[PDB]
Amino acid sequence: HWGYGKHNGPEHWHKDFPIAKGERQSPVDIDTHTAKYDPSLKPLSVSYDQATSLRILNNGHAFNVEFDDSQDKAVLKGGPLDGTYRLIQFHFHWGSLDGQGSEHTVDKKKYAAELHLVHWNTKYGDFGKAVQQPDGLAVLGIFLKVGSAKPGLQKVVDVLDSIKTKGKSADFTNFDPRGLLPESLDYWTYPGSLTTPPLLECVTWIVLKEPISVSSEQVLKFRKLNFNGEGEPEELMVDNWRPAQPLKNRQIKASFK
Numbered sequence: 001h002w003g004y005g006k007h008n009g010p011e012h013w014h015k016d017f018p019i020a021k022g023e024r025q026s027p028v029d030i031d032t033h034t035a036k037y038d039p040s041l042k043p044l045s046v047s048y049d050q051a052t053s054l055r056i057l058n059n060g061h062a063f064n065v066e067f068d069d070s071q072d073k074a075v076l077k078g079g080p081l082d083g084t085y086r087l088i089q090f091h092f093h094w095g096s097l098d099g100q101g102s103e104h105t106v107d108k109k110k111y112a113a114e115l116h117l118v119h120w121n122t123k124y125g126d127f128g129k130a131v132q133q134p135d136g137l138a139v140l141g142i143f144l145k146v147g148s149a150k151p152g153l154q155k156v157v158d159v160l161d162s163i164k165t166k167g168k169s170a171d172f173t174n175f176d177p178r179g180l181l182p183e184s185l186d187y188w189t190y191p192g193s194l195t196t197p198p199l200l201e202c203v204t205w206i207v208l209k210e211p212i213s214v215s216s217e218q219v220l221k222f223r224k225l226n227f228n229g230e231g232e233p234e235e236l237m238v239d240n241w242r243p244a245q246p247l248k249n250r251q252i253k254a255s256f257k
């Protein structure tokens, strides 16, 4: 099955998922001098005050924090989006070393990790229908750099010991995702895809310009998770990122000059 190893990693995915070589694949390098400022872009509207987190899960390739998406509790609107997108889950991609781990890059610079807040367009009724549509998902991407600790991340860090191996889950209620946001909501946006199989081309990407800082100790704890299930040989969950893909016939737009 697919993964991030030498024998099943990103360079092999096209054999099972031919869309890997498609026209709107993610992630991409953001060339800041080629991005086009678009004055028609609206500020993002992030309404997370009523978010209800439920559970944290190690799915074998990352850990997901899942939210109740049965009502318009935590929504994303505005920016390049039409309509209302509900938050369903967030997860991270990270590296084995501080100088790699993000999926998107900025002028070829890699960050230590990248946070993806995943939202789906409510006009399609459920997440499984949304992923079949070119405007089905909106993913907020936030870069992590190593520096000062992020207090709002510590509750996530402290539960990771309980979900070390694939398939483990733990109750994770009352987590407020507003503690993961940077001060500024300036962003780049482009049409893209999921960065894991099935690589569907259903994502409006919104990548925030301002990184958040996390401490070395916080990211070190991400690197203690395991790709494997319990009782299987230990494989550390590191470098679960896909490299940048060709931009092809797409323009990256910026909300700021």
Ligand SMILES: O=C(CCCCCCC(=O)Nc1ccccc1)NO
Binding pocket: 116, 118, 131, 139, 193, 194, 195, 196, 197, 198
């Ligand atoms: O791809 C991304 C960003 C969006 C991830 C969305 C959640 C992953 C997911 O649910 N994938 C999936 C979709 C349809 C069918 C099977 C898996 N990051 O890796």
Ligand SMILES: [Zn+2]
Binding pocket: 091, 092, 093, 116, 195
């Ligand atoms: Zn992701």
